[PDB]
Structure 1
């Protein structure tokens, strides 16, 4: 993927590895080495009008 990894306070259960959003997109991921929860946010995008 591609995004910004921000440390998050998601209440991940010990047996849960990632948290798909309602849109079934992997919103948060458990870091495999350090068992911590990192929220994933898509890098900033938008329209550009002139």
Structure 2
């Protein structure tokens, strides 16, 4: 389904389920990298 940004949304990405606001990320993600995680297991950043 079409990506939605700047609004609370329930998101299932490649079998990963979470509810959070989606915003564009200025993170310099390395190409090999697919997920960015905080101290907690929850995924801070995701690649489409």
> Could you say what the CA RMSD is over the residues aligned between the two structures, in angstroms?
0.8
Structure 1 stretches of 4+ with a deviation exceeding 2 A read none
| Count of residue pairs the alignment pairs up | 31
Give the TM-score normalised by the residue count of structure 2: 0.58
| Unaligned ranges ≥5, structure 1 | 32-50
Where is the strand percentage greater, Structure 1 or Structure 2?
2
| Unaligned ranges ≥5, structure 2 | 1-17
Give the TM-score normalised by the residue count of structure 1: 0.56
Highest relative contact order (Cα 8 Å, sep 6+), 1 or 2? 1
Tell which structure's C-alpha radius of gyration is larger.
1
